[PDB]
Amino acid sequence: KETILVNLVSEQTIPNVQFIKWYFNKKQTPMKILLVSTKEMEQKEKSLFIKNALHFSDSFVEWETIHTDGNDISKTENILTDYFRDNEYKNIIVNITGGTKIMSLAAFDFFNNKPNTEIFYQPIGKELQELYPNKQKYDMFEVLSLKEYLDAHGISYKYDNECVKDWNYNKTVYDLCVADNRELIKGMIALQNNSYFNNVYKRKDFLDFTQIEEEKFIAINHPAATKENMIKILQIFGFDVSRIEHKHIRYITGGWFEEYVYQKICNEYHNVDEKNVALNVTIQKGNDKNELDVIYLDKDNKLHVIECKSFVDGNEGNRVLNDALYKLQAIIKSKFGLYVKQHLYTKSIIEKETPLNRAKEFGIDIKDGTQL
């Protein structure tokens, strides 16, 4: 009521969330927040995502959005004049970073040399600037949580950070279990995709593999997928063959590598806090849903998405590159509006002069078996 904070709305909302978070945490007093937006921005509910990212109580922070023509300098002057006519605000705090160029122009002329007003601008990756009344710069970096970041994009998500095996196990699981058993695992992959085993796990939580008929295993039609081979590979990974959960089957079929990456990040990656790492994530925006192996927001508020493919065998580089590019560009960026750093992690060795080694030129960093 006594302090109003003015933000211009832009497609990328994280800077606005950071500026509001930086001012509120430094003052910690009731205020009103005015968002100056457009028809195009509000059609994407950008004002809503900003609000939700902050999680203020409406008893302490009042929100209001006003619409302007993004290319009409007089319209923005008029609506700001109208809004502030006969105002008794003790502090006006203006952030002209967002919005169109004309909006920032109109906002700057209106608030420049205005009593009790502070104007700010934030260039990408640079220090926050005050432009009026005292030109100076601030080290301004509010780190966000993963949920605030996704709330800022209008994205709800669910994740499962519970791991079948711990980090001590997953450090050496590839050498002691996966490397010398590649053929047995491929039969388990076929077993997981088989209609009988997929269906029966919707009815019950535990299977007993000793009690299953051999014709149920022959139906998989994978030469590795025999009842004895599946029992063997399940015992190799230290599971109780009398009470096998789907969780365990997923671990063998490549989940071990998702856990290895998740745990390694949390235990070894320095520019990231483990509270901002998430495994087995499904993101949702409106009617779009997608699953992501590992995602984390590093300490510089940059979001990283990893595609975990335990093995990229021969003659499949082209397929897995499109799948990855399809997830990155068509889905994550185009349908969800997320500007992420994308990675492909694999235990296989990516030779040069192969399709997958183009990924660097698409913006996808690949970590190889030589890296893992």
Next chain:
Amino acid sequence: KETILVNLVSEQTIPNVQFIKWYFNKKQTPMKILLVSTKEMEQKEKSLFIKNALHFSDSFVEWETIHTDGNDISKTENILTDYFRDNEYKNIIVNITGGTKIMSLAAFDFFNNKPNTEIFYQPIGKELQELYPNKQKYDMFEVLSLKEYLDAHGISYKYDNECVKDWNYNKTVYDLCVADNRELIKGMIALQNNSYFNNVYKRKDFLDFTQIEEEKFIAINHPAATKENMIKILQIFGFDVSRIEHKHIRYITGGWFEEYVYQKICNEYHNVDEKNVALNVTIQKGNDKNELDVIYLDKDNKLHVIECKSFVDGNEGNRVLNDALYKLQAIIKSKFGLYVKQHLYTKSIIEKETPLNRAKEFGIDIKDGTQL
């Protein structure tokens, strides 16, 4: 000398080219053009690309670039004050479309209410706006040549619009010669990239198919490569087996489809002038070279790039999608800085549930055999 034009440089240079072209063609008078740039823009020779796309004589249009800090409102105010101190211009024309937000902020406030000064702004896709001294808009669209467009990206190019067959021929060459000899064409496919024929066309321009001995023919080792059926399919396409040129070979291997597309655009596409269509193009920027099948600048100054794959048979779908994506994003966009509309034209039918059926979600519009 008496009229000056002030433009702020942005990464996408076409708006500046169009505004400069629009004003000179309206006034046609000696003028000075002042480009306000930054170290980042000038590291890309953006001022050079603007100059080179206009092709003015230095006797009539004087160019000068001054450098500022993109996020420092006072440095821009300072360099403009210094430059225009005791100036004698009769007309000052300012275009604040380009540059960063802070540069446009600083340029606008410096030139606003100045005498003999006009200020302009162009939002994307919208009419040009005069902001000062009279608010109004203009139908503003300067059609560009393909050369001006590519010069504006610092790209030189070579091409070859001489076709082997005319449009009347290529209109029906698929039905009457390609469709029912797919097997013989793959035999010349392998003949072209055979080392012997590749070798000899280095030395001479005409090779007489009558006098080549038949183990030159089986060294290709393709089953259909039997000296007589390459004579036969050379005759089917109407060529002089006495004096086959390499160009005739290329025509059968797929060049017929590139000529078909090129000529169909020139003859049938409404929104494109044929003087802006080029075939068999090589583009060059620095030490980067690449070849494109057919490119054209339409009448909306939108650049289109077409990958001509006559047949996309089998289950080679993932491969041609990466090759297309690699060309559009890795090469054309990232190395050449071109924001183009890309197409993939093919005589085959792209079924649904196929890799290439994803292409539209990547922005690649595909014209099938249904449409061709």
